[PDB]
Amino acid sequence: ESDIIFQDLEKLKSRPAHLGVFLRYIFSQADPSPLLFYLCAEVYQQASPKDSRSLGKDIWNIFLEKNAPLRVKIPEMLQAEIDSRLRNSEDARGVLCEAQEAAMPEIQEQIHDYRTKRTLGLGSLYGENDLLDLDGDPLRERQVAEKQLAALGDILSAYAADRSAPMDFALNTYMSHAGIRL
Numbered sequence: 001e002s003d004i005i006f007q008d009l010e011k012l013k014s015r016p017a018h019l020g021v022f023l024r025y026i027f028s029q030a031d032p033s034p035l036l037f038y039l040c041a042e043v044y045q046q047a048s049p050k051d052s053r054s055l056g057k058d059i060w061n062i063f064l065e066k067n068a069p070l071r072v073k074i075p076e077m078l079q080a081e082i083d084s085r086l087r088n089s090e091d092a093r094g095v096l097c098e099a100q101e102a103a104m105p106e107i108q109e110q111i112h113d114y115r116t117k118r119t120l121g122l123g124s125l126y127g128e129n130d131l132l133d134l135d136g137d138p139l140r141e142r143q144v145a146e147k148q149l150a151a152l153g154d155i156l157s158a159y160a161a162d163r164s165a166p167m168d169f170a171l172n173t174y175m176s177h178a179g180i181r182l
Contacts, residue, residue, distance in 0.1 A: 002131055006115060009107060013042065016180050017131060017141050020148025024126040025114045027155045027167065033070040034103035035110065036170035037063040041096040043177045049091075055173070056086040059096070062166045069166045074102045127151055145180045153182065 005011045005018045012019050026032050040059050044052050063072045064082060074082075078098055085092040117123065123131075130144045152171060156164040175181065 002128075006111070006118065009038075009104075009111065012111075013039075015141075016145030016175070016178050017134060017148060020145050020152065021123070021127040021131060022111075022114055023152055023171070024148060024155065025117060026110060027152055028126070030110050030113070031106070032167055032170075033063060033072050034106040036070055036167060036174075037072045038100050038103050038107060039174040040170050041100050043173055044096055045093045046177070053089040056089065056092055056096075058169065058173075060086045062170060064099075069162055070170065072099070072103050074099050078102070142180060145175075145178075146182065149175055149180060149182055 002018065005015050006022065012022060023032075023035070026035055037059070040055070040063070044055050044059060047055055060068075060083065062068055063070050064074070064079065078095060082092055082095045082099060084090070085095060114126075117126070118128070127148050130147050133144050134140055149171070153168070156168050156171075158164075159167070172181075
């Protein structure tokens with residue numbers, strides 16, 4: 001049930017096609033920072049303590065440092081801990097988890113906003129038609145999710161480089177990790 005999935009981030013994280021639809025809305029109308037950050041932090045806390053070290057660094061430069069392009073604001077106390085660890089290639093899974101919590105409120109609001117778009121019958125503008133194609137078969141879900149990823153890239157092709165590059169990096173970091181690639 002899409003209604004069930006779009007309502008809960010925890011469910012959405014696990015459903016690539018749905019996440020893709022939601023992302024198309026985000027990329028088109030809202031600030032992609034909180035969710036892309038969340039998705040990257042999510043990948044980080046599940047990466048090989050080798051791939052994470054550099055991923056931690058990208059996460060810092062893209063979302064958390066002073067002039068990050070997809071800046072996510074977090075408590076000064078937390079920002080310091082995260083900076084230190086990621087900088088020293090230390091274990092930031094804990095603090096990043098703390099950071100994710102800080103982004104949740106805005107993500108939730110965006111989740112509400114997208115549901116409003118659905119209530120208004122605007123879901124087709126963001127790939128919801130392809131959701132009809134889902135038939136429990138994982139092969140199908142990968143195919144629908146893929147179509148969304150392709151559409152997100154088209155959305156990004158129109159944005160300024162200092163915005164599309166980091167968004168593309170973050171997006172692909174998650175999708176790739178989710179077994180979805182163009």
